[PDB]
Design a protein around this ligand. Sequence first.
Ligand code: 1P8
Ligand code: 1P8
Ligand code: 1P8
Ligand code: 1P8
Ligand code: 1P8
Ligand code: 1P8
Lengths: 266, 261
Amino acid sequence: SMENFQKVEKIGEGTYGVVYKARNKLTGEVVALKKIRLDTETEGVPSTAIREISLLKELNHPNIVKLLDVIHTENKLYLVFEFLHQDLKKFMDASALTGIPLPLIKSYLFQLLQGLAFCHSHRVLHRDLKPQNLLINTEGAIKLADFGLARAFGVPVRTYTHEVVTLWYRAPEILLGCKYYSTAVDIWSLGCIFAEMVTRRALFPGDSEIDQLFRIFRTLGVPPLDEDGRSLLSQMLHYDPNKRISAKAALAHPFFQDVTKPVPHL
Amino acid sequence: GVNEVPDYHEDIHTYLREMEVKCKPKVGYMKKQPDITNSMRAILVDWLVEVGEEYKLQNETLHLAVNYIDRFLSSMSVLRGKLQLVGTAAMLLASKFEEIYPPEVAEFVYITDDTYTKKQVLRMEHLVLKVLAFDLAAPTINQFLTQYFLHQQPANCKVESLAMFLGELSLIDADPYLKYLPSVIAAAAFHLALYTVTGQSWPESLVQKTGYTLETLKPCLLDLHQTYLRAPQHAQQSIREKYKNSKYHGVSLLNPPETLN
Ligand SMILES: O=C1Cc2ccc(Br)cc2N1
Ligand SMILES: O=C1Cc2ccc(Br)cc2N1
Ligand SMILES: O=C1Cc2ccc(Br)cc2N1
Ligand SMILES: O=C1Cc2ccc(Br)cc2N1
Ligand SMILES: O=C1Cc2ccc(Br)cc2N1
Ligand SMILES: O=C1Cc2ccc(Br)cc2N1
């Protein structure tokens, strides 16, 4: 099954399982393997995996991580993904002193929005956007990854899982436990991330649900950003979900009228 | 508001329209199954309804499982003794996909009255995933209705119920409803429900979205009207029982209209 793959090193973990970097011996392609243990006498295939696999099959876009293959043993599920050099968080950390040039920020944000509008256009909430789940290569691409908390939504939306999105990146409609939530939640996350690429520190690093709320309140009710930058950010971070800019709309925004595609300092 | 995804409702409609064409079972797969029949399927679907009701599952879940079953039986010969195992695994999968709090496996074993072991259910789950190649995000009748109901004025909660009811009745009967797309079945149901309650018919606003007229939707409405007409006589009665409750406003008790156009 897996005779063709050579383990190279471990690159992360989770209840998901263990994530390895690996090499195809025949093609030389470098991949990431997610190993998902199956509970063959208790629970079977985890609902996380069923959603991640089925949703990633449908989504083929240059800015969504590519699921290459699924290897079905009787005891293990291996998800073969394209390898990307690293995540945005490590890039931000490495950039803490030097900063991230504004062309890169724009490019990265432009791509994230393209990726996410494709999600939204296809009935899919991601629900876990944060720098750790966004991957970059050496050539200037960034992609949405970790669809483990994603969900196929209907129109109009119904009540979905409350326990979604890492705290820092969670929209106010979720913090307050509003009966309904929608695409707006993912935009909020990208909002937080935009701010974060500029300052290289999280916008709303709450210690708890109340701390989070207060941080959002005092801030809404980033120095180096131009007027257009600041405009888009505030529309991405609108309190009202109905008023919050959409991914599709944000792609038009003037901020992007001059967007290029730089390679990063790796 | 954003709950109705204004910037995406259309893109999503188009995408669903295409997916339904690809996530569609074989028409008369049942003629190529030597060991099982339309009647056995009807028993199976009707039981899934009752399961859904017992466990307070979403209707969306029920619709998904039915899609999973028909696609599965489109590829794999199944003996009679194993039909219920396919259905149980399907409902489990659909529950993992769709529900916030799915029932545990042990509950899926329980409802089969210990006909099958937990191992059989879990092994069938895996088989089903393989045969479907993990394509679980099927568009359902329900996913169309939920959209169609936005083009109401006002919203009537009797029409909604009655539309859901009719859509579900179609799940029972491979003959004829396999030959119709979920989007087409959904429209037929919307109209029938409106007429029955309001006297109003298939909205114009929904003609422009879909490209479906009472013209294109005639065959299905005919069949549906028949099914609605004969529902109290039908061997399977879980859906009628389901919609007698206050939850669904009691629309299965309503009298069908004698005629249309
Ligand atoms: O044969 C098929 C039918 C089908 C449905 C969905 C997706 Br994604 C791929 C495929 N291929
Ligand atoms: O065996 C399988 C089923 C399956 C699902 C998804 C992807 Br990507 C690859 C494969 N191969
Ligand atoms: O979604 C995921 C999780 C993950 C982590 C790292 C790399 Br490279 C790829 C992927 N794919
Ligand atoms: O085997 C049987 C007998 C029976 C009783 C009730 C319901 Br609902 C379904 C079935 N199927
Ligand atoms: O014992 C039962 C009850 C029941 C419900 C549904 C199906 Br399919 C088969 C059976 N057998
Ligand atoms: O969503 C669908 C499409 C479809 C085709 C056939 C039958 Br029976 C039921 C259903 N429900």
